Symmetry: C3
Subunit: 114 residues, 3 copies
């Protein structure tokens, strides 16, 4: 899986260990080994949510499977929770796009997973 967060929160407010915690929590949440989890945190972004420049985040989670109605609610509770607690971002200022990728459409190690 691959989780990306873009945020206007400054780099110095991202706690040490944040990418490790995300790796670990997403491994548990998706059922995928942590070896397969990629994480990407982009701070200091020029962005707005509802025309306000208060802290916000735009995120995506791509996974081959493990995407759906109930699961995405669960990911959103987990991920909004972490962004609120570690980055101090209110949950109603977070968007997360979920993508169920077909294995044939995911390249890795000179090939694809199909």
């Amino acid at each position: 899986p691959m989780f990306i967060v873009n945020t206007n929160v400054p780099r110095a407010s991202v706690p040490d260990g944040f990418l490790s915690e995300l790796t670990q929590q997403l491994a548990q949440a998706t059922g995928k080994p942590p070896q397969y989890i990629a994480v990407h945190v982009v701070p200091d972004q020029l962005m707005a949510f509802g025309g306000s420049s208060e802290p916000c985040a735009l995120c995506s989670l791509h996974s081959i499977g493990k995407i759906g109605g109930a699961q995405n609610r669960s990911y959103s509770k987990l991920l909004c929770g972490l962004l609120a607690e570690r980055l101090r971002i209110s949950p109603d200022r977070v968007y997360i796009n979920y993508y169920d990728m077909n294995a044939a459409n995911v390249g890795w190690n000179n090939s694809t997973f199909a």
Copy 2:
């Protein structure tokens, strides 16, 4: 909705009011309250368009509904106009990926919209 602009135009050339202008214009274009519009502008990018490093933009608009053949042609005109006037980017150097997102694949406020 979620609107993102990646561009090689330097940060100093992005006007301070561009995010708010995009928010308002997108709110009218989509018929959605401004509070739910998120906008993200990423300047100083290392990019090329047609092999040229003249100013260009790679963009995306995510939305639950309000996406489709005719609406997207309308959006391209609105967004090329804004990018051309505010960022001085030629409209034939602008790409916009449109995404019609399922409500169950959009997380917000600890849940999804489904």
Copy 3:
């Protein structure tokens, strides 16, 4: 088409002719005209792959057609090889998401490609 690379490799390790090389190689690989190929490289990113902060990349290729099982494996070999030779990133630490976009969902110069 549109090709993006996000990587933790430093800005200084990106060869000067890298954008041009990606443009030329993707034209050959997809058969699309080079005038319509956009490339985007984002270095110095805070990211982890498999819990590790060794060099990695998260990439995407959007195209109207020319996306499929066999082609994606060919693209992966081409692009992973380019990232290994030019950015010294191991292919086993690269993900590439492929997107077959509908022509009506790709905006360009005040319209779409539909």
